[PDB]
Amino acid sequence: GAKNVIVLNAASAAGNHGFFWGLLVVTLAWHVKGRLVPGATYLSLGVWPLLLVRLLRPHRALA
Amino acid sequence: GAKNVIVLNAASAAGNHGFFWGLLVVTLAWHVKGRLVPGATYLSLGVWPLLLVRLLRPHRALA
Amino acid sequence: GAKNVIVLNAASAAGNHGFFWGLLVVTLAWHVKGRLVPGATYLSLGVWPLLLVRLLRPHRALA
Amino acid sequence: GAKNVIVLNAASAAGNHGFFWGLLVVTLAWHVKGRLVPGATYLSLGVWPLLLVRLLRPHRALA
Amino acid sequence: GAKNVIVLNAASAAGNHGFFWGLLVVTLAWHVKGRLVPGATYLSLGVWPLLLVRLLRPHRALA
Amino acid sequence: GAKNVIVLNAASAAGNHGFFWGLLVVTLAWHVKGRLVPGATYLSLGVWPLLLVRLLRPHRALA
Numbered sequence: 001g002a003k004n005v006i007v008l009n010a011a012s013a014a015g016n017h018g019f020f021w022g023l024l025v026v027t028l029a030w031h032v033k034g035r036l037v038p039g040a041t042y043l044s045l046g047v048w049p050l051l052l053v054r055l056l057r058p059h060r061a062l063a
Numbered sequence: 064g065a066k067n068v069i070v071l072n073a074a075s076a077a078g079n080h081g082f083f084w085g086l087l088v089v090t091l092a093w094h095v096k097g098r099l100v101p102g103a104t105y106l107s108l109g110v111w112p113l114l115l116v117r118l119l120r121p122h123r124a125l126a
Numbered sequence: 127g128a129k130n131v132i133v134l135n136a137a138s139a140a141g142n143h144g145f146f147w148g149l150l151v152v153t154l155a156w157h158v159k160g161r162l163v164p165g166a167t168y169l170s171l172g173v174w175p176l177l178l179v180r181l182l183r184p185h186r187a188l189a
Numbered sequence: 190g191a192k193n194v195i196v197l198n199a200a201s202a203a204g205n206h207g208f209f210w211g212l213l214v215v216t217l218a219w220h221v222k223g224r225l226v227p228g229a230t231y232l233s234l235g236v237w238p239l240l241l242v243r244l245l246r247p248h249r250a251l252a
Numbered sequence: 253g254a255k256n257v258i259v260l261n262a263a264s265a266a267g268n269h270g271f272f273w274g275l276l277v278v279t280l281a282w283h284v285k286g287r288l289v290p291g292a293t294y295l296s297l298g299v300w301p302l303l304l305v306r307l308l309r310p311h312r313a314l315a
Numbered sequence: 316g317a318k319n320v321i322v323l324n325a326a327s328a329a330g331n332h333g334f335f336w337g338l339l340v341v342t343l344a345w346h347v348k349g350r351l352v353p354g355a356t357y358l359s360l361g362v363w364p365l366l367l368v369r370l371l372r373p374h375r376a377l378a
């Protein structure tokens with residue numbers, strides 16, 4: 001009653017692998033290249049987003 | 064040390080805690096309804112898929 | 127080796143700690159707003175979905 | 190296989206750490222900016238949606 | 253708090269488990285069926301992108 | 316108790332165990348092939364990304 005829980009997780013890790021799966025992460029990052037430039041332009045965003053963050057900002061482990 | 068580490072993970076959980084976040088799961092589930100029926104159509108792919116599955120089927124865990 | 131593992135996970139948690147990351151999750155939830163209403167209207171999949179769920183319903187950590 | 194299962198998880202964390210991969214997360218968060226304003230429109234969403242949320246509301250960590 | 257940190261994670265897991273949520277996973281998989289066939293057809297990228305992937309292939313865990 | 320929290324996670328892993336799920340990961344990887352080449356051709360920044368990563372670069376798992 002121990003190595004039968006975490007072990008299951010281990011199986012998932014094998015599935016992800018680094019071959020085909022590795023390619024997917026790299027490819028996605030490259031594609032957003034063009035996406036990145038339009039995204040950059042945007043005014044009126046000084047603290048408006050931060051207020052939402054304020055809820056997040058205190059944080060609490062023992063939530 | 065042993066602590067602080069796991070504690071940090073808990074903080075992430077706090078971030079998740081947000082009624083808005085909960086709402087997102089429901090919307091995705093409802094939308095897929097329509098997606099599901101077209102998917103069922105068994106066009107040209109009776110056994111072709113399964114060969115790929117064989118690689119997946121062992122589900123190694125040694126990694 | 128012992129702490130040179132869980133500690134590594136903790137480092138990932140620090141990475142999450144970013145206002146930008148927090149903003150993305152909240153934003154995604156809001157977007158599905160419009161998506162949610164069409165999903166509601168369908169009227170179908172009465173008993174057809176549940177049968178599949180039956181396999182899923184017992185669930186088990188053994189796997 | 191004591192220190193082997195947890196170790197595997199650590200390896201996954203290494204995979205996440207990257208240059209190109211990091212850029213994608215930041216870009217996506219700011220970009221959704223535009224998506225957020227349309228989302229705000231509360232067209233017939235006063236409280237009706239919440240009833241569905243009630244199912245989600247108990248949560249129950251017992252699972 | 254020993255049994256409070258990990259416990260928080262468990263709560264998240266319970267939330268993931270459900271009826272509507274289960275449906276989402278199956279539908280997404282079925283839908284990509286048709287998506288998969290066009291993907292297969294792609295000229296070039298047979299033996300050239302892999303070299304970049306090679307850097308990823310050794311992988312590590314000493315992150 | 317001790318063997319209960321982690322046990323819940325194991326249950327999630329069982330859910331993944333599904334050939335259909337396996338199909339989705341491979342499909343996504345194949346599709347991005349085409350996405351990868353357009354990404355390669357864009358603009359010449361060179362300094363725009365590194366500045367962002369630089370903030371990330373010191374790292375502080377002591378979050």
